Design a protein around this ligand. Structure first.
Ligand SMILES: Cc1ncc(C[n+]2csc(CCOP(=O)(O)OP(=O)(O)O)c2C)c(N)n1
Ligand SMILES: Cc1ncc(C[n+]2csc(CCOP(=O)(O)OP(=O)(O)O)c2C)c(N)n1
Ligand SMILES: [Mg+2]
Ligand SMILES: [Mg+2]
Ligand SMILES: [Mg+2]
Ligand SMILES: [Mg+2]
Lengths: 207, 207
């Protein structure tokens, strides 16, 4: 019931404890190259040699060819596909960062897509020292994840945030403008945060 | 009249053609270690050894000690300081990315700070394969930068965007929701874009 997507980012970190393995473009080649299952290879594969795509084309339990010129990114397309086949499943996206900033932002703001927003609570961005979760507009609580030390909140579409029970709080009584409030920490208690509309992007990090 | 800031990110790329050289935390050590001028070392330096901070403490033409617990990031503080000393000067920030996602976002959305917004057109984020510019709300035009191939637009605080004269346009007649519209390209003509409010973040990239 646990799916794992190996994006085209830099997979210097990844886990193997997963039911289904999805590989976007280069991720497909990475998976194989690491003695790992390739249940699904998706994307336009414009980021892999014919030599590599030859091994993927004859090893992937399933392969999806996506148009070169489109609106959704291979990772976006991959997440949309899976949510259709499995429905509300738990996803972890590896290699969602690195290299290009435009692509990273695309992953950081995946929920911004109307079709993904509803499932924004089913997938996460993860790598060596970063963990990214997405919360719909409203009231929420969060407990610190293992390994991680710092935590930050950022509302896509500038809606005022509220943060309590954290080392640094953000009340309506001391609010100071900033897109992302980083370097915050827990303190033996769940952190409370909320947002009138949109959705919040929580980023737990370490090091 | 050209200032350059060497942040604590990964400086695998940088230029030397600058009047003033500013170094945030680790950047200060990097600058020296590269036979480069250190006109200003700023930050809390909690990211450098006493051994390194000993060389910085006695080489920096100027050094600023910032509190450990604060609201602004060393880079934010550094940019605010310079804009005070020089006023509207041209800045290029190196090592604004890498490692932590929370810090990257802080640099990606630097204009989100009320005190920086006014000077958002005076500084840029740059590295190996990425170039980041910031434009205030309103009408604007942009010509492709050298070396870069792709270009993307993203409005902080979700305001509808408009994009014309680019390979892919975003009109009010075909609009589709998404935080960042990436992988767009120029085509022998300036790209026109605008936003009712807030500010736009343009990211030219390559590779
Ligand atoms: C508003 C307008 N902006 C830009 C695009 C172009 N675009 C956005 S997603 C995408 C797909 C390409 O990205 P990806 O699948 O990650 O492959 P890559 O960019 O690495 O070649 C394209 C072409 C568009 N169609 N809509
Ligand atoms: C709303 C609330 N969120 C979080 C903070 C904590 N905070 C935001 S910027 C910052 C400075 C630390 O960052 P930086 O200067 O880059 O050093 P580093 O995080 O690498 O140790 C802190 C402590 C705050 N004061 N306001
Ligand atoms: Mg691709
Ligand atoms: Mg492509
Ligand atoms: Mg610091
Ligand atoms: Mg610090």
């Amino acid at each position: 019931t646990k799916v794992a997507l190996f994006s085209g980012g830099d997979l210097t970190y990844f886990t193997r404890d997963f039911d289904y393995f999805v590989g976007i473009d280069k991720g497909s080649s990475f998976l194989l190259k690491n003695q790992l299952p390739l249940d699904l290879a998706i994307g336009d594969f414009d980021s892999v040699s014919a030599e590599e795509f030859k091994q993927i084309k004859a090893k992937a339990k399933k392969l999806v060819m996506a148009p070169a010129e489109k609106n959704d990114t291979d990772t976006e397309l991959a997440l949309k596909t899976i949510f259709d086949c499995f429905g509300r499943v738990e996803i972890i996206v590896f290699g969602a960062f690195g290299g290009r900033i435009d692509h990273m932002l695309s992953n950081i703001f995946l929920p911004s897509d109307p079709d993904l927003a509803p499932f924004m609570r089913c997938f996460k961005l993860r790598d060596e020292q970063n963990l990214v979760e997405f919360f719909p507009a409203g009231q929420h609580q969060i407990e610190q994840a293992t390994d991680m030390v710092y935590i930050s909140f950022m509302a896509a579409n500038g809606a005022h945030l509220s943060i309590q029970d954290a080392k640094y709080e953000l009340t309506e009584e001391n609010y100071f403008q900033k897109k992302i409030y980083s370097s915050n920490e827990f303190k033996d208690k769940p952190i409370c945060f909320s947002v009138a509309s949109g959705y919040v992007v929580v980023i737990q990090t370490k090091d």
